[PDB]
Design a binder for this molecule. Structure first.
Ligand SMILES: NC(=O)c1ccc[n+]([C@@H]2O[C@H](COP(=O)([O-])OP(=O)(O)OC[C@H]3O[C@@H](n4cnc5c(N)ncnc54)[C@H](O)[C@@H]3O)[C@@H](O)[C@H]2O)c1
Ligand SMILES: NC(=O)c1ccc[n+]([C@@H]2O[C@H](COP(=O)([O-])OP(=O)(O)OC[C@H]3O[C@@H](n4cnc5c(N)ncnc54)[C@H](O)[C@@H]3O)[C@@H](O)[C@H]2O)c1
Ligand SMILES: CCNC(=O)Nc1cc(C)on1
Ligand SMILES: CCNC(=O)Nc1cc(C)on1
Ligand SMILES: [Cl-]
Lengths: 343, 343
């Protein structure tokens, strides 16, 4: 009878997490304003319509904006939530630099309003979908939870760090609160059905969607930003986690809340980084297609390598990533091939 | 003609700044929600009614909350502002620890909404009243504008740092913006008339109100947290600026905006810290009263000395603080004697 609110649940990570919630026997209620999700032929976002088909279970959904205080108040009176998993936000790094106020409005004001209504209704159990960009430029590797946070170099990253700090302070002030902050890097891959996945609008900003678009013929060549890094092959080494593993980590965090854990922070990841060229090669193998690329200048603010240590999650969340590079690529490619234009 | 919006202009630093604006020939419009200011017998806050009397000039005033987007929209259509000086916020360091969400809501969401409406109306000139607590615990002294920021532990400090970062990012994204961030420590004293000053606060940020209250006989003794610090007399050395000098610094910042300066950051202060015992002594002299004190243990997290270097402001704002510790004490005492319960 108690429900789990999932904000931004129509999106890439959200929709995968809704599916995992349903399969694990929880009752999700999703809100989304369709900022970055596709509308289906019915009331549901297309992603969540397919989730219903994939699971045989229904998703309760309300189209609303977390910036709408009155809608939030109504939502919290209407449903009895035992916890909230918070994905609603803006997440494009390049757009954040250009439009910082939008990022701070949606991410900060949105989160503060959510926390306020949660507090008002005594829902004091939160999984926050954070970002390992909060660690800033790596001072050692792999990044663990003891590594410094802050000194991010873009508004997106700062907004994530600021939210973490607000949550930490809330939990300090009220020990009844339980919150799990999950830090990870690049979600990749798709549900094994190939029926849902990441559906970028326009030219993709992340590597893997771009590479899949090259493979499918929609793009000519991948731009590789620098090949003179202090890495094995010269290209940037980055951290890629299968979205299904990531979604399962959000479930493990939800369960951790039941232990009355207070404020906890965990990295989610495989513990192994891959270079740009390693991902291209893996996508060529998965796709059976040539993926042309062109080396261009380093991108402002990029470092040689960043990857996370997931040992703490393994020990305290009972969680490990099961899906490796080839699976990420195979699952991405299936989504791409089955859905050449996305939703 | 063009006006200067002063948010939180009914409060202590705000009201003094309004008077300085009037004396310098600007046209102020104040907004305040009376969260921490006293209502007068007419439409104006008592502070601003007395400012009118002091200057012989009128202050326009609207009672509204910076959290109210619709009220902000109406305000910016109603008046034509050339610039905004932003004091509206919560500012009790001790209260922030107990109620962090309120600090983040008012300070962050309030500022974001202000910046958004400013952008929407092409008002791109801001003086932000910041806090030198953004430097965190001193790594060297005196603190200058090159010193690291962030690493504040209290929510108030963090909120101020986060606002600075949002403003910096806004100005990075739009070079047409001009903003001056003013960092200072503890305002004290009062207008020389003795007719305005700081009202009794719930949770003061500094010892001066307590010392004045001991001298007036409202309190028995001052608690001195430690007398074994690495300082000349063993008591903690802290940074105090006369509120009139502070207010004049906000005017200097306003003028700097005309230079199309972009984002600029200046410390304001006298350049010399004062110990607890020096303040006691100075208030004894000013008051002609004995001020008993009791040395108690150090407060966890307190440092021996913390004060700001104001050289950059002299060089680039043409501004110096002229009023010293004795004057701060004399002016505080006059306000206290003329107005034992504030307004
Ligand atoms: N994609 C990544 O690489 C990545 C990495 C680290 C962290 N994250 C975090 O995950 C979350 C985003 O998830 P995603 O990658 O699935 O992106 P996404 O854009 O696919 O999903 C976010 C969802 O939030 C919705 N939304 C946005 N603003 C909203 C608002 N004001 N009210 C209601 N709904 C709103 C969008 O419509 C979208 O459906 C954010 O918290 C982001 O910081 C993403
Ligand atoms: N007093 C200090 O020790 C100190 C030190 C450094 C910086 N500052 C900064 O100075 C400003 C506060 O000035 P002050 O010390 O004169 O305090 P104050 O409380 O006297 O003034 C702040 C004013 O803002 C008003 N206000 C609060 N919330 C508001 C809201 N939501 N909408 C509209 N009005 C609102 C209050 O009613 C008050 O009149 C803040 O920006 C604070 O961070 C103060
Ligand atoms: C989508 C555009 N291409 C890339 O993401 N290329 C990259 C990423 C990194 C790192 O280096 N080149
Ligand atoms: C509560 C009033 N007393 C003080 O503020 N005392 C102090 C302040 C510092 C510093 O050391 N003692
Ligand atoms: Cl369950």
């Amino acid at each position: 009878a108690e429900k789990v609110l999932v904000t931004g649940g129509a999106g890439y990570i959200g929709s995968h997490t809704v599916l995992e919630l349903l399969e694990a026997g929880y009752l999700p209620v999703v809100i989304d304003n369709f900022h970055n999700a596709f509308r289906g032929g019915g009331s549901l976002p297309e992603s969540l319509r397919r989730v219903q088909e994939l699971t045989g279970r229904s998703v309760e959904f309300e189209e609303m904006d977390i910036l709408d205080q009155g809608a939030l108040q109504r939502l919290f009176k209407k449903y009895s939530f035992m916890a909230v998993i918070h994905f609603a936000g803006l997440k494009a790094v390049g757009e954040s630099v250009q439009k910082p106020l939008d990022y701070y409005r949606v991410n900060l004001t949105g989160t503060i309003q959510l926390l306020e209504i949660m507090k008002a209704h005594g829902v004091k159990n939160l999984v926050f979908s954070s970002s390992a960009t909060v660690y800033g430029n790596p001072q050692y590797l792999p990044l663990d939870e003891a590594h410094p946070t802050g000194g991010c170099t873009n508004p997106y990253g700062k907004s994530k760090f600021f939210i973490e700090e607000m949550i930490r302070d809330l939990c300090q002030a009220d020990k009844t609160w339980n919150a799990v902050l999950l830090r990870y890097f690049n979600p990749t891959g798709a549900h094994a059905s190939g029926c849902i996945g990441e559906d970028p609008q326009g030219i993709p900003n992340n590597l893997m969607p771009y590479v899949s678009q090259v493979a499918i013929g929609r793009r000519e060549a991948l731009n590789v930003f620098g090949n003179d890094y202090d890495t094995e092959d010269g290209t940037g080494v980055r951290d890629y986690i299968h979205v299904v593993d990531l979604a399962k980590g959000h479930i493990a965090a939800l369960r951790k809340l039941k232990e009355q854990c207070g404020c906890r922070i965990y990295n989610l990841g495989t513990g192994t980084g891959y270079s740009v060229l390693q991902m291209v090669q893996a996508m060529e193998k998965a796709s059976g297609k040539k993926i042309p690329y062109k080396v261009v200048a380093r991108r402002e603010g990029d470092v040689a390598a960043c990857y996370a240590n997931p040992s703490l999650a393994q020990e305290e969340l009972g969680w490990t990533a099961a899906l490796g590079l080839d699976r990420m690529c195979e699952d991405l490619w299936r989504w791409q091939k089955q859905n050449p234009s996305g939703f």
